[PDB]
């Protein structure tokens, strides 16, 4: 297969069904502050934007910090067991490995937690570098994720590509000059932005579109 040298995958929504786990803690967080919780389409509608901003988009601004820590605690308590990945992704990772391409990830709910989760599933060592979120800070650390990951996996290979689902990964990869392919795993709400510089990007509906796009 005419695969690249390294493929950076998303680890939040493209790698696992975080929806189940997130909805669990999401319900707890809002209920903890006396706020209601809409069920149903909220599962997919919370997939896409960062939980911090998603919660802020749900109306939380003042007691947002309280709900955030509640979400984190509940997610760290039960959210880890409310996830899975057995589907086309499994054989995909195997086939990609067969082609001789190096795989890595640059997106995380929390790096320490990601280390645990990926270790639990047993796909941790199947990736070269696991990165995404070292700490929740300020400024535009949107590029540093991929940037720092690359400096770790150095030297830098000729062919690099990202696989995501959101404008966050497509913009970051393009910011460093790395091509990317977005999938159609979910359907969020914060899809439409005002500042859209990057309009062109390949879209993979099913898992088979990924393999052929990557060239495995």
Swiss-Prot record:
Top EC class of this enzyme: transferase
KW NADP (keyword) present: no
A single cellular component GO annotation: cytosol
Keywords (A to Z) from UniProt: ATP-binding, Kinase, Nucleotide-binding, Phosphoprotein, Transferase, Tyrosine-protein kinase, Virulence
Activity: how regulated: Activity is increased by phosphorylation.
Modified residues annotated as Phosphotyrosine in this record: 187
Biotechnology note: PtkA-PtpA (TK-TP) interaction could be a good target for drug discovery program. Benzylbenzofurans and benzofuranamides disrupt the PtkA-PtpA interaction, which inhibits activation of PtpA and leads to the decrease in intracellular survival of mycobacteria.
Protein purpose: Required for growth within macrophages. Catalyzes the phosphorylation of PtpA on the tyrosine residues at positions 128 and 129, thereby increasing PtpA phosphatase activity and promoting pathogenicity. Also phosphorylates the thioredoxin reductase TrxB.
UniProt name for this protein: Tyrosine-protein kinase PtkA
Organism name: Mycobacterium tuberculosis (strain ATCC 25618 / H37Rv)
Gene: ptkA
Residues represented out of the complete protein: 76 to 291 of 291
């Amino acid at each position: 297969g005419e695969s690249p040298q390294l493929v950076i995958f998303d680890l939040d929504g493209t790698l696992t069904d975080s929806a189940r786990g997130i909805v669990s803690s999401f319900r707890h967080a809002l209920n903890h502050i006396g706020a209601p919780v809409p069920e149903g389409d909220l599962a997919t509608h919370i997939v896409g934007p960062p939980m911090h901003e998603t919660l802020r988009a749900m109306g939380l601004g003042e007691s947002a910090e309280e709900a955030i820590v509640a979400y984190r605690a509940d997610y760290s308590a039960r959210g880890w067991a409310m996830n899975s990945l057995f589907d086309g992704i499994g054989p995909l990772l195997a086939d990609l490995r067969t082609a001789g391409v190096r795989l890595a990830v640059a997106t995380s709910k929390a790096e320490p937690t990601a280390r645990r989760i990926l270790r639990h599933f047993g796909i941790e060592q199947h990736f070269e570098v696991i990165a995404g979120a070292s700490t929740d800070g300020s400024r535009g650390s949107k590029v540093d994720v991929l940037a720092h990951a690359l400096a770790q996996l150095r030297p830098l290979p000729e062919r690099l590509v990202m696989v995501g689902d959101r404008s966050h990964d497509v913009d970051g990869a393009a910011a460093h000059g790395i091509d990317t392919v977005v999938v159609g795993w979910g359907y969020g709400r914060a899809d439409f932005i005002d500042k859209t510089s990057t309009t062109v990007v390949t879209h993979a509906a099913t898992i088979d579109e990924l393999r052929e796009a990557l060239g495995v």
